[PDB]
Design an enzyme around this catalytic site. Structure first.
Site, mmCIF file in Angstrom:
data_model
loop_
_atom_site.group_PDB
_atom_site.id
_atom_site.type_symbol
_atom_site.label_atom_id
_atom_site.label_comp_id
_atom_site.label_asym_id
_atom_site.label_seq_id
_atom_site.Cartn_x
_atom_site.Cartn_y
_atom_site.Cartn_z
ATOM 1 N N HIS A 83 37.165 33.872 44.605
ATOM 2 C CA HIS A 83 37.451 32.510 44.182
ATOM 3 C C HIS A 83 36.212 31.591 44.307
ATOM 4 C CE1 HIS A 83 41.595 33.967 44.829
ATOM 5 N NE2 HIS A 83 41.703 33.402 43.653
ATOM 6 N N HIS A 87 34.253 33.155 38.965
ATOM 7 C CA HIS A 87 35.642 33.217 38.554
ATOM 8 C C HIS A 87 36.047 32.030 37.719
ATOM 9 C CE1 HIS A 87 39.960 33.683 38.596
ATOM 10 N NE2 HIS A 87 40.131 32.579 39.318
ATOM 11 N N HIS A 123 40.106 24.761 38.254
ATOM 12 C CA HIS A 123 41.443 25.176 38.753
ATOM 13 C C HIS A 123 41.381 25.843 40.135
ATOM 14 C CE1 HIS A 123 40.404 29.335 37.701
ATOM 15 N NE2 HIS A 123 41.467 29.695 38.386
ATOM 16 N N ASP A 124 40.185 26.284 40.573
ATOM 17 C CA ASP A 124 40.053 26.908 41.920
ATOM 18 C C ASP A 124 38.976 26.204 42.789
ATOM 19 O OD1 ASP A 124 41.955 28.934 42.384
ATOM 20 O OD2 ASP A 124 40.808 30.482 41.281
ATOM 21 N N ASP A 241 43.545 33.098 33.877
ATOM 22 C CA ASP A 241 43.407 33.311 35.332
ATOM 23 C C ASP A 241 43.697 34.760 35.651
ATOM 24 O OD1 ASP A 241 42.808 32.357 37.894
ATOM 25 O OD2 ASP A 241 44.835 31.697 38.284
ATOM 26 N N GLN A 292 45.907 47.728 42.344
ATOM 27 C CA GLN A 292 45.738 47.344 40.926
ATOM 28 C C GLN A 292 46.831 47.917 40.007
ATOM 29 O OE1 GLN A 292 43.520 44.877 40.184
ATOM 30 N NE2 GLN A 292 43.512 45.002 42.436
ATOM 31 N N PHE A 295 49.736 45.644 40.764
ATOM 32 C CA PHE A 295 49.381 44.351 40.159
ATOM 33 C C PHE A 295 49.604 44.354 38.659
ATOM 34 C CE2 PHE A 295 45.729 41.352 38.913
ATOM 35 C CZ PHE A 295 46.482 40.217 39.071
#
Ligand SMILES: COc1cccc(Nc2c(C(N)=O)cnc3c(C)cc(S(=O)(=O)c4cccc(C(=O)N(C)C)c4)cc23)c1
Ligand SMILES: [As]
Ligand SMILES: [As]
Ligand SMILES: [As]
Ligand SMILES: [As]
Ligand SMILES: [Mg+2]
Ligand SMILES: [Zn+2]
Length: 336
Positions: A83, A87, A123-124, A241, A292, A295
């Site tokens: 983050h 990113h 956004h982060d 995102d 992953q 995810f």
């Protein structure tokens, strides 16, 4: 018009070379970072805005833009593994691509385009590299400020908007009062939608609107009211995102390395505090590869399959890449 941020003359050319891929899913943001003296967010945003003529459309000074973007990028922690500003650069460039998908051609106003790219950029910001739940559980200053609700997402918005307060950095100075008010509402909506705790419900509502979607004769989605427009926008930024597994495997693997480094660092902090370790943060037991596969199976594929469904057939190669990538991680798990 800035063309380099460093002392390397070879970089100016290399950077402009990478930037020829600005409108493509296949852009390599790691290379951009490397050729821009670690200014991927400043440079990609400058490229995107020029590409879309947004500085001209909104009478944004190039000088003010660069100052604001440099300082926003400076509020991402370079010591947070995932983050960080790379990113943010990636989510912004990915949003820029989705904005041009043929199915949405002519759908969005310039103000909505602007709102969406700015939301992605911010956004982060100032992410400390631990989750909302970790902040809530540790009685952090942020969780006490925000009453345990979308703690980081509220914070990222507060920083991004607070940075515009100083005249020298106010990129929205020449918007009208009503323009600024609508932009602020859209961005707040989009950023808060990046909270993973909202994803199941966002997706439900998305699967819902895909059902009653009205593709016009020419093949363009009909999104006639604001409500429908901001719902696609909020989902777009969410997809951006969560786009890492849909990129080329070369890139996806580098992103995985980073997110696992960040997660496992949280696990270490938890251990250190005698807290209960969150399973996927435990470096001693968690499988990167299963993490992953799961995810993708449980979060990324259902989202992208639904987005794809909405923008048919725009997103077909994205899906195939995702499924290929899913297959590669699975094949990396030694058990059947
Ligand atoms: C949008 O916010 C995030 C935060 C963290 C990761 C991602 N995307 C992921 C990535 C990625 N590269 O985008 C990779 N692996 C992930 C894996 C293996 C899991 C999850 S998760 O199911 O969303 C999850 C489960 C448990 C805890 C946490 C957490 O720490 N936060 C802050 C949400 C997240 C997300 C990702 C997105
Ligand atoms: As640049
Ligand atoms: As400033
Ligand atoms: As994330
Ligand atoms: As975790
Ligand atoms: Mg976030
Ligand atoms: Zn993010």
């Amino acid at each position: 018009s800035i063309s380099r941020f460093g002392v390397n003359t070879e970089n100016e050319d290399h950077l402009a070379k990478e930037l020829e891929d600005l409108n493509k899913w296949g852009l390599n943001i790691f290379n951009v970072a490397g050729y821009s003296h670690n200014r991927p967010l400043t440079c990609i945003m400058y490229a995107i805005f020029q590409e879309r003529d947004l500085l001209k459309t909104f009478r944004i000074s190039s000088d003010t833009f660069i100052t604001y973007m440099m300082t926003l990028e400076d509020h991402y922690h370079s010591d947070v593994a995932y983050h960080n500003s790379l990113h943010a650069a990636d989510v912004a460039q990915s949003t820029h691509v989705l904005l041009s998908t043929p199915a949405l051609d002519a759908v969005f106003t310039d103000l909505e385009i602007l709102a969406a790219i700015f939301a992605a950029a911010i956004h982060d910001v100032d992410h400390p590299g631990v989750s909302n739940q970790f902040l809530i559980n540790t009685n952090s200053e942020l969780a006490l400020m925000y009453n345990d609700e979308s703690v980081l997402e509220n914070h990222h918005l507060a920083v991004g908007f607070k940075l515009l307060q100083e005249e020298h950095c106010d990129i929205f100075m020449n918007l009208t009062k009503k323009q600024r008010q609508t932009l602020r509402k859209m961005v707040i909506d989009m950023v808060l939608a990046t909270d993973m705790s909202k994803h199941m419900s966002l997706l439900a509502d998305l699967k819902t609107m895909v059902e009653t979607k009205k593709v016009t004769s020419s093949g363009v989605l009909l999104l006639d009211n604001y409500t429908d427009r901001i719902q696609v926008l909020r989902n777009m930024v969410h997809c951006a995102d969560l786009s890492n597994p849909t990129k080329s495997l070369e890139l996806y693997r580098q992103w995985t390395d980073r997110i696992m480094e960040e997660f496992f660092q949280q696990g270490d902090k938890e251990r250190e505090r005698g807290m209960e370790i969150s399973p996927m943060c435990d470096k001693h037991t968690a499988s990167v590869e299963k993490s992953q596969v799961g995810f993708i199976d449980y979060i990324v594929h259902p989202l992208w399959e639904t987005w794809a469904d909405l923008v048919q057939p725009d997103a077909q190669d994205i899906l195939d890449t995702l499924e290929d990538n899913r297959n590669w991680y699975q094949a990396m798990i030694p058990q059947a």
